[PDB]
Design an enzyme around this catalytic site. Structure first.
Site, PDB file in Angstrom:
ATOM      1  N   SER A 172      54.870  60.731  39.184  1.00  0.00           N
ATOM      2  CA  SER A 172      53.768  61.476  39.781  1.00  0.00           C
ATOM      3  C   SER A 172      52.453  61.312  39.031  1.00  0.00           C
ATOM      4  O   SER A 172      51.411  61.720  39.554  1.00  0.00           O
ATOM      5  CB  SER A 172      54.135  62.957  39.867  1.00  0.00           C
ATOM      6  OG  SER A 172      54.167  63.552  38.582  1.00  0.00           O
ATOM      7  N   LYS A 217      52.512  72.809  41.055  1.00  0.00           N
ATOM      8  CA  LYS A 217      51.363  72.097  40.508  1.00  0.00           C
ATOM      9  C   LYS A 217      50.059  72.783  40.890  1.00  0.00           C
ATOM     10  O   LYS A 217      49.158  72.922  40.058  1.00  0.00           O
ATOM     11  CB  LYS A 217      51.361  70.644  40.982  1.00  0.00           C
ATOM     12  CG  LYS A 217      52.389  69.763  40.301  1.00  0.00           C
ATOM     13  CD  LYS A 217      52.380  68.363  40.888  1.00  0.00           C
ATOM     14  CE  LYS A 217      53.384  67.467  40.187  1.00  0.00           C
ATOM     15  NZ  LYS A 217      53.506  66.148  40.859  1.00  0.00           N
TER      16      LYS A 217
END
Ligand SMILES: Nc1ncnc2c1ncn2[C@@H]1O[C@H](COP(=O)(O)OP(=O)(O)O)[C@@H](O)[C@H]1O
Ligand SMILES: Nc1ncnc2c1ncn2[C@@H]1O[C@H](COP(=O)(O)OP(=O)(O)O)[C@@H](O)[C@H]1O
Ligand SMILES: Nc1ncnc2c1ncn2[C@@H]1O[C@H](COP(=O)(O)OP(=O)(O)O)[C@@H](O)[C@H]1O
Ligand SMILES: [Mg+2]
Ligand SMILES: [Mg+2]
Ligand SMILES: [Mg+2]
Lengths: 520, 514, 180
Positions: B422, B465
């Protein structure tokens, strides 16, 4: 005494073999002298309890009729023609011989295809008792072979437990996840025609006849099953479903079952065919219908809540309001590349979860001594070797096809398979890697809807690869129009149903020199 | 026999009861066999057969109970309300397998107790994270000395109902998976056999509430046959609301105080949330609140004061000097460093990617990678380096930095293991910013897998996140376009001030950040 | 006076003494000691076993200790060596219904279910034993437990424990302890 008469009344209707009868007689005589308070009395009573509960002479009355069994099989499941053919053949053989018989089968395929439900349906059609136990992750042999009477915690194991429960000597026993077993040596004795008739359990200390038991094993990959165990059983492939088959299953089986599960009715909640198609093509990505079932259950749960809350007397699910029930689509993007630039070629993959589409990307690491290839993408050792072979063959091929093109012999190249977090293995991507390298070297993109698979040799020969059916299903799902396959896989590709390959322009190849002409 | 008057006993248990009673009627009391038979018959008679708890099925009272007990948790509440509706349509009690997965301390254990209260069911919880054997959930046979029928029989006994709510805690850390398949599966849950007593009890009506921190470590069969319900973390204002409404009153009540003796101001709770704690949950906040109220109780009893008001001026007198004195590692990011986002079992967090020259000059350049990065993350870094070089070849052909300079890449959490692709786009941004000598937007965060051609691929943990990013005070966030579904599942107040960009190729990210 | 006897019994551990003093304060304000039980944890030889005796002197309660390793539920009443669980003879010799109970080194427990019976307020007042056919009300007794490590303790026990750490001693503190 009362105990002896009880055990003999348990034994009246069974046609017991002579040796078992002698064992029961001697154990009864032993029990006739022990004091009731003795621990050995408890052990002998517990032993006689198991011996007098085994159905030594009882068989279930099978429905030896092809028509009714075929009707049951085709009404309970869709598209499992191989399993249904095998069971009809079993019934025909049982009828021709005029006696019950036992066989050892194995259903292997991606999860959610219906391997256990079909086994329950088979037990229903044959009028056989049904029992199942799982050997996945099993590391203890004693749960099959049992423990002898000496130990306090002794049990006669899963097979004797099944025999006691089902009260028949010809039940249907499902052994689940045989490929995930840790222990297999007990199974080798359990399912082997030479010794099924004399299966000896450590607790019983007397053999039982398991020759008439129908054993059905379940797995996902055959290669992980132990080698001596893979030889005893018959392998039947329960393959995944195409979108049309999944739609048929959802319309005919999944939605009607989930309606009853949620307590709804057809007049209360209607699932349009467009809704099911949208759920299949955008809310699930699998070979089975496992996630489709959960999505349907979610939709019907939302419908039930709407009905109970009084927001509406009846609810119709439409692709316009489907997001009210399941939210935004999960798989809006079907292909990573709509149009592929030079240096990337689309391929096919096959795993325990079924078939999938992959891409092979190449690019320069340095501008404009030797050149080199860097490989990334969590590829296994076999696929790294395949990439090395493909790089060597690409150099050799470009040497003779375009002598002036020194691209591959001087440039430093990086090769990646964009699914970076997923481990990958297998030599089936060699031709794809060769094509990607050649397209990068020439600056020309490949046919924009072409997919391909096949092992490549150092001289360029294309070798057969496995999983042709799943790869073809994935190609059809991804909108592939032209597929390139090894010529040795022609016998595997034309075994497919017409609706799986009606739109594919298929090319079968022996050497890469003609794959080059197909793709360029 | 007197204990079985009202029970709807199964047809296959009266034979066992009768034979046990007949054996008991002839054994002498002083024998050990008599005692073990007494224990076995007591267990068989105390275990309820056929009786069910009167589950209330009012979508209005249960909705009110669920809303008053816990703040937020819209998905869990919707799931429970629709479960109640399905039970109403069926006309009979039912059970299902649910899994609450999320960061620790977000209320997954307490929401199950609230659900049990709302459904008028009984509640039990046991942990399976520290379990490596199999006998504990099924007990030992009556022949073993000191044998007990495991935990499940104890639960169904003391709850005195066939449909309790059982919380399966800390599932994601099984050391016995197949033992959980034979219980958490509707195809076999209808007949579960104990080892102390071989009677197969029917547990199809039992509502199993699984609890875990992350789904990916849950074994494939278990996670596949149970429903995933995500219990996300909380932003600062949600933490303040939870503390004012629930944490502070509960900690005050358990300490024996009342609102007149000890008062906690909103500023004190804001200081505790922002400084004295750093988590997605409220566990550490709860501990700090209990510490403050316990010290207040000590002050009250000792006679130091008749009433105490906690204020930011005297907060150190209760909790000492502030921990986490800095909200973020970089306030203004130098050219070579770019903000990133991470997701772990403890919730989301913000990482940074630092790059700098390793050699004094400005044969080819090289990239050293440190920071306890995983193998997948190292591969992501290599792909990012190659794509950054390729991108700089076309955006600025005269820029020889990336192709000749030797670069060191570090992630300043040098002692914590980190993995995942990511951060590919973050690494590309860091490399390009170092090469161009330009810092990114000072309040920009970003995440997303990158391919060798520059395509941005979806990543997991978008909710955590974004929560961590909002905690870190970022104003602009870049996400992959395929994560737009996950981003908008957040409440509207979370994404109030965040400037959101959804991207498909790195060219968009380059245009946004520079 | 509790603070005075804690100071006279043990040197150092000012933070620990503050924590126990907070415990008596909150228990007194609540009007009862029933609630979470204290769990002192730390390296070996750090005063954990004696800190609880100092607490018992501080609260003017009787003191008792038994280490785990069922002895909690004793033996059935027969001619054959009948002897009930450990808790009852504590009541015998302490001559009160509210002694301080120290549970020593919970990590080495083999009878977790029987131990959990004492810790639940809903059944601690209805304690049953094998030798005694009559319930005993343990509402007023106080429990404190000690452990060298907290991770390996039973999970149903850990959630009931309010962990208190003992930070050890410095050279000067150890010198003072040795001299005194
Ligand atoms: N061809 C089919 N026809 C009807 N139902 C199906 C078909 N394939 C799958 N299903 C449904 O999907 C479910 C699959 O569950 P199961 O068979 O236990 O999984 P697996 O196939 O991995 O063993 C079954 O409940 C079954 O009803
Ligand atoms: N949204 C919320 N509303 C009310 N209380 C909450 C909320 N989230 C957490 N809590 C409180 O935090 C405490 C600890 O949470 P816990 O159940 O341990 O979370 P987890 O199960 O994720 O570990 C609980 O007592 C609960 O009351
Ligand atoms: N702070 C202290 N003040 C006085 N004596 C102490 C102190 N710490 C330890 N001791 C002494 O150490 C001896 C043994 O400690 P002990 O309580 O057995 O250690 P543990 O906490 O491992 O059980 C005790 O007799 C006690 O007198
Ligand atoms: Mg199955
Ligand atoms: Mg919890
Ligand atoms: Mg000690």
């Amino acid at each position: 005494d009362a105990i002896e008469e009880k055990f003999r009344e348990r034994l009246k209707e069974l046609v017991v073999p002579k040796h078992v009868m002698d064992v029961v007689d001697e154990e009864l005589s032993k029990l006739g002298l022990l004091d009731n308070h003795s621990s050995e009395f408890n052990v002998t009573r517990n032993y006689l309890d198991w011996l007098t509960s085994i159905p030594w002479g009882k068989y279930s009355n099978e429905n030896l009729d092809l028509a009714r069994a075929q009707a049951v099989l085709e009404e309970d499941h869709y598209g499992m023609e191989d399993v249904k053919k095998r069971i009809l053949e079993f019934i025909a053989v049982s009828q021709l011989r005029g006696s019950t018989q036992g066989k050892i089968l194995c259903f292997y395929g991606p999860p959610g295809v219906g391997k256990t439900s079909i086994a329950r349906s088979i037990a229903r059609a044959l009028n056989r008792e049904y029992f199942r136990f799982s050997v996945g992750g099993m590391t203890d042999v004693a749960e099959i072979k049992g423990h002898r009477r000496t130990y306090v915690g002794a049990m006669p194991g899963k097979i004797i437990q099944c025999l006691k429960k089902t009260k028949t000597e010809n039940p249907l026993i499902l052994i689940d996840e045989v490929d995930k077993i840790g222990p297999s040596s007990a199974l080798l004795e359990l399912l082997d025609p030479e010794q099924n008739a004399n299966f000896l359990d450590h607790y019983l200390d007397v053999p039982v006849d398991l020759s008439k038991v129908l054993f059905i094993c379940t797995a996902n990959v055959t290669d992980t099953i132990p080698e001596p165990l893979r030889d005893r059983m018959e392998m039947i492939n329960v393959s995944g479903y195409v979108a049309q088959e999944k739609l048929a299953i959802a319309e005919r089986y999944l939605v009607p079952q989930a309606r009853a599960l949620c307590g709804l009715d057809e007049s209360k909640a209607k699932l349009s065919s467009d809704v099911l198609t949208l759920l299949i093509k955008q809310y699930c990505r699998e070979s089975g219908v496992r996630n489709l079932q959960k999505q349907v259950e979610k939709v019907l749960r939302k419908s039930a809540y709407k009905i109970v809350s009084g927001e509406a007397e009846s609810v119709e699910v439409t692709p316009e309001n489907l997001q009210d029930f399941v939210g935004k689509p999960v798989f809006t993007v079907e292909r990573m590349y709509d149009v592929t630039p030079p240096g990337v070629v689309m391929g096919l993959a096959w795993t325990a979860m079924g078939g999938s589409t992959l891409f092979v990307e190449t690019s320069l690491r340095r501008p404009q001594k030797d050149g080199s290839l860097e490989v990334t993408g969590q590829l296994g050792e076999v696929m790294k070797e395949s990439a090395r072979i493909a790089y060597t063959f690409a150099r050799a091929f470009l040497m003779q096809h375009a002598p002036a093109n020194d691209y591959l012999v001087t440039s430093h190249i990086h090769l990646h398979v964009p699914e970076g977090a997923t481990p990958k293995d297998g030599p089936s991507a060699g031709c794809t890697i060769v094509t990607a390298l050649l397209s990068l070297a020439m600056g020309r993109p490949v046919r924009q809807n072409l997919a391909m698979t096949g092992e490549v040799s150092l001289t360029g020969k294309i070798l057969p690869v496995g999983g042709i059916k799943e790869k073809t299903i994935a190609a059809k799902r991804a909108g592939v129009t032209c597929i390139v396959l090894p010529a040795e896989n022609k016998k595997d590709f034309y075994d497919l149903a017409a609706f799986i390959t009606e739109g594919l322009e298929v090319h079968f190849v022996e050497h890469y020199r003609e794959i080059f002409d197909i793709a360029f």
